[PDB]
Design a protein around this ligand. Structure first.
Ligand code: D57
Length: 208
């Protein structure tokens, strides 16, 4: 059906970004975090205390240069364990490959699959209201999900961790992330921060 139409759009956008410095993974990281924040703000209109777990609506990005990791943390609606298992309808549980999705592909396919332009794995730590906090890890093909051993550390929202390839080590430099976040967040209504350094003290720096 239209599942091939959205897949066609996804191939077009991901390969197009391969010419332009493979930056579409970061634009999608910011855009999807913004939509998740929009979702919980819409819910807070009906629910009185929908923000009781985390009363702030932010996007916070931190680089781990020595560990070669990229963290993007938003305080959006989050995802239940049942929502992590569904993901975007294309990732199966580990060991079950030999056994709608079109709407999930059209919205999240570009963001998920373009992350593997620079990352070997994609790890999702999410905390949704009325559910515990879980960790979800995928190799682009299969996934595995467990409950976070640390418990509820986000209050509410989602942290996307990208285990970057060494090929993409230059993305973790402060001046690189900051210029890229500033470019792709100038139209996001929510405040977006990057863990930056000032001389030496470290603190969140507003980028938009
Ligand atoms: C690939 O990271 C995301 O797309 C993503 C993000 O960057 C920031 C977020 O806050 C959230 C989020 O929690 O939205 C509530 C997501 C998940 C967006 C989503 N909502 C329903 C399905 N998906 C796609 C998906 C992909 C992999 C595993 C699970 C779900």
């Amino acid at each position: 059906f239209a599942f091939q139409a959205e897949v066609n759009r996804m191939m077009k956008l991901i390969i197009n970004s391969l010419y332009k410095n493979k930056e579409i993974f970061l634009r999608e990281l910011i855009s999807n975090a913004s939509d998740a924040l929009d979702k919980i703000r819409l819910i807070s209109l009906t629910d009185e205390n929908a923000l009781a777990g985390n009363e702030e609506l932010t996007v916070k990005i931190k680089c781990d240069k020595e560990k070669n990791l990229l963290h993007v943390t938003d305080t959006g609606v989050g995802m239940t364990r049942e929502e992590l298992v569904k993901n975007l309808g294309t990732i199966a549980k580990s060991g079950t490959s030999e056994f709608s999705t079109s709407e999930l592909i059209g919205q999240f396919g570009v963001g998920f699959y373009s992350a593997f332009l620079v990352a070997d794995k994609v790890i999702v730590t999410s905390k949704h209201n009325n559910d515990t906090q879980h960790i979800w890890e995928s190799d682009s093909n299969e996934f595995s999900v467990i409950a976070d051993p640390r418990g509820n550390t986000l209050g509410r929202g989602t942290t996307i961790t990208l285990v970057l390839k060494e090929e993409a080590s230059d993305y973790l430099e402060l001046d690189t992330i900051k210029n890229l976040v500033k470019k792709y967040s100038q139209f996001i209504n929510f405040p977006i921060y990057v863990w930056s350094s000032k001389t030496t003290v470290w603190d969140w720096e507003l980028m938009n």
